[PDB]
Design a protein around this ligand. Structure first.
Ligand SMILES: *C\C=C(C)/C=C/C=C(C)/C=C/C1=C(C)CCCC1(C)C
Ligand SMILES: CCCCCCCCCCCCCCCCCCCC
Ligand SMILES: CCCCCCCCCCCCCCCCCCCC
Ligand SMILES: CCCCCCCCCCCCCCCCCCCC
Ligand SMILES: CCCCCCCCCCCCCCCCCCCC
Ligand SMILES: CCCCCCCCCCCCCCCCCCCC
Ligand SMILES: CCCCCCCCCCCCCCCCCCCC
Ligand SMILES: CCCCCCCCCCCCCCCCCCCC
Ligand SMILES: CCCCCCCCCCCCCCCCCCCC
Ligand SMILES: CCCCCCCCCCCCCCCCCCCC
Ligand SMILES: CCCCCCCCCCCCCCCCCCCC
Ligand code: NA
Length: 265
């Protein structure tokens, strides 16, 4: 199926690769639940006109609590321990570890994380509906092609790469539209909130770039590399989780901070 299974069918997992990964995937959904409550309880702090931003952060949290919990469980129950070999192996009776919970969680989240900036910041010469439609089309295709190429990670790898770049194309378009949005958004706000908008843009830049980094993480050292192992698996799943907290939780926090800062009139 995927590289995670491959490693759990051929070489198996050491007990520390398996516990680490399970522990990191549990942290991912725990944060989402703490985030959900933070966004709900803080909506009283921001003027009515920016509250749609909190509402959207809260629904992204419900989406990511549930599906990152599904994902966590699909990792634990897909592997059983072999006491004779001392490593964890793909359980033929279990479900087989799957990526479809994460990619679905991206597909749902992506219109919402992009739409929500447009409820805090104002455009100048760009058209709102123009920006919205560009966000929703390319963020869907970025993820849908990302999911397709994900099927060919273990099998045909040039399909894994031709697709991963197709999805890069949509990715870079979003970065372009986000960049115009943040610029027009800086016009006619205080220097304080401009600073936050600049933060939001650096965060939006790093946190989203981690995602294709974790896509290639095992092949990043070549087809016979130090990461071609239960190591680039650990690191792939450590990087997704970092990119999940940053792009969903931290991002929504800086937006709520920006909103509050724009209620200094
Ligand atoms: C959790 C919410 C969001 C919006 C997640 C976004 C993820 C990405 C931007 C991932 C992009 C990919 C790229 C650029 C190429 C390989 C396939 C990925 C889906 C990992
Ligand atoms: C600037 C206001 C202070 C920022 C607080 C951010 C709150 C994030 C809530 C989620 C983090 C929970 C981490 C522990 C979960 C385990
Ligand atoms: C604004 C107030 C922010 C408080 C953030 C507290 C988060 C606690 C996370 C779990 C420890
Ligand atoms: C305004 C109250 C802030 C609550 C902090 C966020 C809740 C963290 C739960 C863990
Ligand atoms: C509409 C916001 C909530 C989206 C929930 C998506 C369904 C989650 C499915 C979890 C089980 C797989
Ligand atoms: C349209 C492509 C977007 C990602 C779809 C993911 C669906 C897979 C759901 C996983 C369920 C496992 C059983
Ligand atoms: C404003 C949110 C619109 C998108 C929510 C549902 C996400 C797409 C479902 C697939
Ligand atoms: C300078 C304001 C902080 C921006 C980054 C916030 C997240 C840092 C990691 C915690
Ligand atoms: C657009 C794809 C970005 C991938 C970043 C991976 C960085 C690898 C550095 C070696
Ligand atoms: C926005 C948070 C910055 C995360 C930078 C990447 C963290 C390094 C993890 C890679 C492990 C290999
Ligand atoms: C002016 C911007 C300052 C906002 C600070 C927001 C940083 C909050 C960091 C919360 C980290 C939650 C993740 C916990 C991981 C365990
Ligand atoms: Na996720």
């Amino acid at each position: 199926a995927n590289f995670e299974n491959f490693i759990g069918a051929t070489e198996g997992f050491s007990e520390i690769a398996y516990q680490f990964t399970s522990h990191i995937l549990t942290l991912g959904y725990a944060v989402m639940l703490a985030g959900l409550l933070y966004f709900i309880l803080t909506i009283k702090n921001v003027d009515k006109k920016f509250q749609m931003s909190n509402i959207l952060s809260a629904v992204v949290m419900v989406s990511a609590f549930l599906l990152l919990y599904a994902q966590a469980q699909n990792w634990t129950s897909s592997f059983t321990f072999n006491e004779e070999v001392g490593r964890y192996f793909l359980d033929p009776s279990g479900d087989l570890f799957n990526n479809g919970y994460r990619y679905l969680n991206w597909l749902i989240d992506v219109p919402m994380l992009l739409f929500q900036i447009l409820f805090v910041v104002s455009l100048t010469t760009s058209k709102f509906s123009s920006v919205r439609n560009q966000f929703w089309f390319s963020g869907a295709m970025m993820i849908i092609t990302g999911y397709i190429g994900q099927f060919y990670e273990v099998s045909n790898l040039t399909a894994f790469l031709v697709w991963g770049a197709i999805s890069s194309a949509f990715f870079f378009h979003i970065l372009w539209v986000m960049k115009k949005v943040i610029n027009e958004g800086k016009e006619g706000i205080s220097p304080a909130g401009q600073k936050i908008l600049s933060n939001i843009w650096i965060l939006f830049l790093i946190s989203w770039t981690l995602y294709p980094g974790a896509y290639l993480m095992p092949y990043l050292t070549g087809v016979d590399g130090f990461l071609y192992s239960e190591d680039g698996v650990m690191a792939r799943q450590l990087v997704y989780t970092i990119a999940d907290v940053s792009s969903k939780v931290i991002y929504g926090v800086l937006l709520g901070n920006l909103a509050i800062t724009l209620s200094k009139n």
